[PDB]
Every structure is written in C-alpha cells, then in structure tokens.
Amino acid sequence: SSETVVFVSGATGFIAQQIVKTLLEAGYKTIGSVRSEEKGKYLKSLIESAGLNSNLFNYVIVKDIAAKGAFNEALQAHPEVTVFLHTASPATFEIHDVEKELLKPAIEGTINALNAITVYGKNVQRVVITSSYAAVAGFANLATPGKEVNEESWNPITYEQALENPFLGYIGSKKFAEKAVWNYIEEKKPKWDVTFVNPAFVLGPQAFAVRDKSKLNASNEIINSLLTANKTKVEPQQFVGYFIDVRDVAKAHLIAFEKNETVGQRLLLANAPFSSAGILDIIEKDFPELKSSLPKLDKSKAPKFEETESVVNNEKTRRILGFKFIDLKKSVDDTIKQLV
Numbered sequence: 502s503s504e505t506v507v508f509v510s511g512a513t514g515f516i517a518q519q520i521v522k523t524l525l526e527a528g529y530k531t532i533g534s535v536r537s538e539e540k541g542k543y544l545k546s547l548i549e550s551a552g553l554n555s556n557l558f559n560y561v562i563v564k565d566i567a568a569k570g571a572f573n574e575a576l577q578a579h580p581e582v583t584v585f586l587h588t589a590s591p592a593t594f595e596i597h598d599v600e601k602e603l604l605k606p607a608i609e610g611t612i613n614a615l616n617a618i619t620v621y622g623k624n625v626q627r628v629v630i631t632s633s634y635a636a637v638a639g640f641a642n643l644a645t646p647g648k649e650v651n652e653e654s655w656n657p658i659t660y661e662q663a664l665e666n667p668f669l670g671y672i673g674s675k676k677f678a679e680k681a682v683w684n685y686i687e688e689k690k691p692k693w694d695v696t697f698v699n700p701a702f703v704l705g706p707q708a709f710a711v712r713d714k715s716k717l718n719a720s721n722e723i724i725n726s727l728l729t730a731n732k733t734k735v736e737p738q739q740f741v742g743y744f745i746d747v748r749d750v751a752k753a754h755l756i757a758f759e760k761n762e763t764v765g766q767r768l769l770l771a772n773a774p775f776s777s778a779g780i781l782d783i784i785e786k787d788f789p790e791l792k793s794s795l796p797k798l799d800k801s802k803a804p805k806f807e808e809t810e811s812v813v814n815n816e817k818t819r820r821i822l823g824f825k826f827i828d829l830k831k832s833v834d835d836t837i838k839q840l841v
C-alpha cells in the first residue's frame with residue numbers, strides 16, 4: 502500500500518471526485534490532473550473540509566488532455582506514480598461538432614495519456630481506463646433488444662455512424678477511445694497492464710459538494726430534471742437503461758488496480774434496469790415534501806425497456822468486484838438529499 506501512488510486524470514469531474522474521495526478514504530497517495538490552478542485549489546479545499554488527509558492529495562495542471570504530450574510534464578514531476586486512472590473525457594451532449602468536440606478529444610486524449618505513461622511513467626504498473634457500457638451494447642438502429650451482452654461484447658457502431666448526432670457521438674467516442682487502447686497495447690506492447698471500467702448510467706451524490714443545484718453532471722440530470730421542471734417549465738425527457746451508483750463505480754476503479762484477475766478485463770458496471778418514471782416513483786414516495794412539484798410524465802413519451810435494451814450478464818464482473826451494489830432507491834435518495 503505505502504508504495505502505491507495513484508494518478509487520476511480529470512480529477513474535478515463527477516466520477517473522478519468520487520474516485521479521489523474513495524482513494525483518500527483508503528489512504529492512497531493520489532495525484533489529480535486538473536485544468537487550472539483554481540480547480541486544483543478548489544478540490545484541495547473540498548478534501549480538507551471533508552476531514553480527509555489532504556496531504557495525500559496533490560494536483561497537476563493539464564489544461565487539455567487532447568494536446569499532444571499533455572501528461573508529459575506531470576509524469577516527469579511524479580516518477581513515483583504506479584497506477585494511472587484515465588477518467589477524463591467529454592461526457593456531455595452540450596456540443597455542436599461531434600468529431601472535433603467528442604471523438605478526437607476522447608481518442609487523442611487517450612492515446613496521449615498512453616504515450617505519456619509509456620515514455621515518462623516508468624513505474625506505472627497498472628492503467629485503468631474509464632470506458633462505458635456504451636462500448637459494450639448497441640444503441641438505436643444497432644440495439645439488440647433481448648440479446649445477452651457481457652464483458653466481451655462490443656457495440657458495432659462505426660466511426661461514421663457516431664457522427665450522426667451528439668448521443669451517438671458520445672457512444673462512439675467511448676467505443677473508439679477503448680479500441681485505441683487495445684490497439685496501443687498491440688502496437689507498443691507496453692510493460693504496464695490495463696483494466697477497463699465500463700459503467701452504464703451513473704447516478705448518485707456528488708463526492709463533496711453540489712456546485713450548482715440547478716444543473717448537475719449529465720447522467721444525474723436524469724434525476725435532477727424531474728426536480729427542476731416545476732421551475733423551468735421544461736418537460737423532462739424520459740430514459741430507460743441500466744444504472745450504477747457512482748460510489749460502486751469509484752470502488753470498482755480501486756478493485757481494477759488492486760486485484761490481479763482484473764488485468765485485461767472490462768468490468769461491466771451495471772446494477773439494474775431503471776426508467777425515468779421509476780425514479781419519479783422513488784422521489785415522490787421518499788420525499789413527500791416534493792410531490793407538489795414533480796411533473797406528470799406523459800406515458801406515451803416513455804421508452805420501453807424491452808423495445809431497445811440488451812440483457813446484461815455481468816456475473817463475472819460481480820464476482821471479481823466482490824461487493825454488493827447500491828440499489829436504485831438509495832442512489833436516488835442520496836442524490837436528492839444533496840438537492841433538497
């Protein structure tokens with residue numbers, strides 16, 4: 502343990518802050534990449550206010566993961582890094598050019614991190630890539646409803662199909678960033694081992710603080726848009742799929758470098774099906790002070806699970822992780838409790 506030093510790219514993001522929190526709670530020396538000095542100081546202050554050992558956390562400034570050589574200076578300054586958690590990637594549909602704002606920042610950010618690790622991360626033994634269930638199952642025209650998917654399945658979406666719209670663009674960004682790692686391992690044959698963490702829709706509370714209660718990270722807006730509709734008058738879009746709580750995703754990233762069976766594995770981080778209506782049901786029962794303000798969901802606008810969703814078999818992932826997942830009710834409750 503004392504010899505382990507974990508680097509986390511994009512440390513201010515939703516999942517990454519929970520990873521950083523989980524690492525510090527476990528006592529790991531942690532180095533977080535951030536886009537600015539003020540973002541680094543902000544995260545250090547959150548860590549200190551939470552009562553954690555902030556001497557365990559340092560930050561490096563990496564303004565743009567997409568820039569060639571992005572992580573070079575950081576790893577040069579930190580030759581003690583033995584684990585690299587590459588989590589940073591655009592996770593938003595608030596973009597206009599898929600290719601410029603999703604594909605290449607994801608793909609080249611990832612290729613640049615790997616080149617930086619191989620050249621300046623001489624002590625890195627384990628690399629963990631935050632991928633996505635998006636790389637595992639097909640979507641929209643490529644949906645395979647009722648077909649089993651598991652840790653070995655791939656989304657067949659082509660590069661050109663990813664260009665169609667921002668949702669498919671994000672999906673393709675994850676599939677092709679992941680393919681880029683596998684191809685890098687084949688071509689460069691690095692000495693480090695790789696593990697992938699592939700989460701479905703990630704729900705749950707922020708690690709330390711809600712910056713702006715009006716708008717959370719993109720996946721948690723599935724919850725928050727039900728809360729803010731009363732004020733914004735914006736009809737909430739309804740979703741169906743699989744969910745996972747952010748704290749299980751964060752724990753999975755530690756398992757990913759702590760265990761030997763995870764080498765070369767894609768950990769499929771999916772708990773159970775969800776729908777927007779089912780989340781609304783949890784909210785109205787668990788927070789009666791909110792039923793006054795919750796929207797009336799048009800059942801005709803609701804995606805039906807059986808029409809689109811593959812059937813996840815992640816028994817292997819579940820065995821390797823070895824802990825019980827947080828269920829949807831707790832995940833939603835804990836998210837709301839930070840907003841109410």
Ligand SMILES: NC(=O)C1=CN([C@@H]2O[C@H](COP(=O)(O)OP(=O)(O)OC[C@H]3O[C@@H](n4cnc5c(N)ncnc54)[C@H](OP(=O)(O)O)[C@@H]3O)[C@@H](O)[C@H]2O)C=CC1
Pocket residue numbers: 511512513514515516517535536540563564565566567588589590591592606631632633634675699700701702703704718719720
């Ligand atoms: N949330 C989900 O449901 C899922 C998320 N994922 C993956 O998890 C990871 C984090 O997602 P999440 O935490 O949800 O989303 P967030 O938007 O909360 O975090 C995104 C992070 O990426 C950083 N980032 C984006 N572009 C750049 C760039 N060009 N240079 C440097 N930093 C950059 C942001 O930096 P800053 O903080 O400075 O903006 C932020 O830290 C992503 O790889 C995402 O694809 C995978 C499956 C599902």
